[PDB]
Design a protein around this ligand. Structure first.
Ligand code: HEM
Length: 153
């Protein structure tokens, strides 16, 4: 697809729509996670010991926000520049994943959980051209973190 001017305009537009409601989209995101894969619950300090996904836990909100930000920034950088750039932060991300017991097979879990979350966020504006654009940008960003975990292992 590439990332045409017209595609990037479509991710930016759809991210601004996500951030517009963090405590919803983020608790949704964690439920789509636990639907796709229930065991994933023991991983999260803030979910351990609990029985249901807390809805106002700051630890959880802060966590999930940071995750979508990072995917959007990735799409812009792909249309301007043509790439996703690996920095200190992605590197540290890879460390903390490993300490907590996270593996690669866990990633399509969190992708489908983000596509399905953005398809839920944009609703009728949804196009092929836009699904194509978020897929490209997640795939391109996961390639980069998985890279850094393998390296923290
Ligand atoms: C491109 C995709 C991904 C991005 C951008 C991302 C981003 C992040 C960030 C930024 C943190 C640190 C949050 C903090 O310091 O507050 C974190 C922690 C963590 N992540 Fe991910 N992540 C991704 C995929 C995954 C996957 C597939 C899993 C496995 C289900 C996972 C499991 C965890 C766990 C257990 C923690 C530790 C949280 C703790 O116990 O408090 N992440 N992630």
């Amino acid at each position: 697809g590439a990332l045409t001017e017209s595609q990037a305009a479509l991710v930016k537009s759809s991210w601004e729509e996500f951030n517009a409601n963090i405590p919803k989209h983020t608790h949704r995101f964690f439920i789509l996670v636990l639907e796709i894969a229930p065991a994933a619950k023991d991983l999260f300090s803030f979910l351990k010991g609990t029985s249901e996904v807390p809805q106002n836990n700051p630890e959880l909100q802060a966590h999930a926000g940071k995750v979508f930000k990072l995917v959007y920034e990735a799409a812009i950088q792909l249309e301007v520049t043509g790439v996703v750039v690996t920095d200190a932060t992605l590197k540290n991300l890879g460390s903390v994943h490993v300490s907590k017991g996270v593996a690669d097979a866990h990633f399509p879990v969190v992708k489908e959980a983000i596509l399905k979350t953005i398809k839920e966020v944009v609703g009728a504006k949804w196009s092929e051209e836009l699904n194509s654009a978020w897929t490209i940008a997640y795939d391109e960003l996961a390639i980069v973190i998985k890279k850094e975990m393998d390296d923290a292992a």
